[PDB]
Amino acid sequence: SAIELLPFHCPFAAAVNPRLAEIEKLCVDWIDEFRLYQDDAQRERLIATKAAEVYARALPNAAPERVADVAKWLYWGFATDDMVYDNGPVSVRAADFLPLIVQLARIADEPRSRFGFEIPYTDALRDLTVAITAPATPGQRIEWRSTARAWFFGMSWDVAYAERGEIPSLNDYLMMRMHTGGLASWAATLGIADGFELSARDADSPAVRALLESWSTFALIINDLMSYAKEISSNIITVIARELSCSPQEAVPHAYSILDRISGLFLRLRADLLPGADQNLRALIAGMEHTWRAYLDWGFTSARYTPYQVFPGWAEQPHDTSPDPLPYPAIAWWWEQVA
DSSP states (O other), rough: OOOOOOOOOOSSOOOTTTTTHHHHHHHHHHHHTOOOOOHHHHHHHHTTTOHHHHHHOOOOTTTTTHHHHHHHHHHHHHHHHHHHHHSOOOOOOOHHHHHHHHHHHHHHTTTTTSSSSTTHHHHHHHHHHHHHHHSOOOHHHHHHHHHHHHHHHHHHHHHHOOOOOOOHHHHHEEEEHHHHTHHHHHHHHHHHHHHHOOOOOHHHHHHHHHHHHHHHHHHHHHHHHHEEEEHHOOOOOHHOOOOOOOOOOHHHHHHHHHHHHHHHHHHHHHHHHHHTHHHHHHHHHHHHHHHHHHHHHHHHTTTTTTOOOOOOBBOOOOOOOOSSSOTTTTGGGGEEEEE
C-alpha cells in the first residue's frame, strides 16, 4: 500500500567532489572494460544509478582516482544485485545463496582465490578489490576484509527472511539493518579513499561503536524510506506496520520518530567525541556528515530509487526530539555512551 513521505531533517550542507565528471568517466570506462551488463539497456540503467556521484558527495575532498576506485564496489554491487535477485519467480533459497556468497567474500579477502563455478562480473570483483586495497594501509585492508565479510553475512539474513516470506521484529531489524546495508564497508571505503584510519582504541571504544552503529542504522532507514515506493519484506515501513499491527501509512510517523531519535543520538555522540577527536576520527565524522547528505541529495535524483517518489522536502526541525533511549534492547546500549 502506497505511503506519503515526510520532509527530512539534516543540519549539514550539500557537498560534492568538484572533479565528479572525471570520477564518472573513470567508472564508465571501467564498466565497459568489464562489461558489467548483458545489453545496452542494462548498461544505461547501471550508469543511471550514479554510484560515482553518491561516493563523490561522501568524499568531496578525496583524490578523484580513489573516489572512482571505491565507486567500482557500488557499481559491481548494483550490477550483481540486478542479476542475482532477478533469477526466477521462486525466492532464492538461503542454502543455494550461502555457498555463492562465501565465494564472493573470499574473493574480497584474496582475489587470487578461484572456484570451479563463478557468476558473471567476478573478474570485475577481483579488479576492484585490487584497485581499492593495493594502495591502502595494512590496517585499512584488514578493515576492508572484515566489513566486506560482515556485509555478505548480512545479505544471507535478508535471503533467509525472503525464503520464509516472513518479516523480522523491529528489534531484530534494528540489530541487522546496519549489517544487511553494509555501512561498515561504506565507512571502510571512505577511510581508504579519503586517507584516514581509526586507532584500535577509537574503533573499539563503545562511544565510537555507538556513533558508527547509530549513523549506519538511520542512514539505512533513509535508504528504506527512499526505496519503499519503488519496492511496492524487510523495509522499516513493512517491519513497523507488522510490529504495531498498523497500515504502511500509519507506520510513516513511527519510522520518522525512530529516524530522528537515532539521528538525534548520533548528533549527541558526535558533539561528545569531536573536541577530543584525532585527525582520523575527525575525518570519519566528516565522512559520516557527507554520507547523510549524499544519501538524501543523490537518493531522490538517482534512477536506483526513481517518478516513484518525489522529494518530500526539508524539515525545519526533527519530527521527534526525545533524548530517551529507544525501547529496543538490541540497540538500547547506544544511549549508555552519551557523556
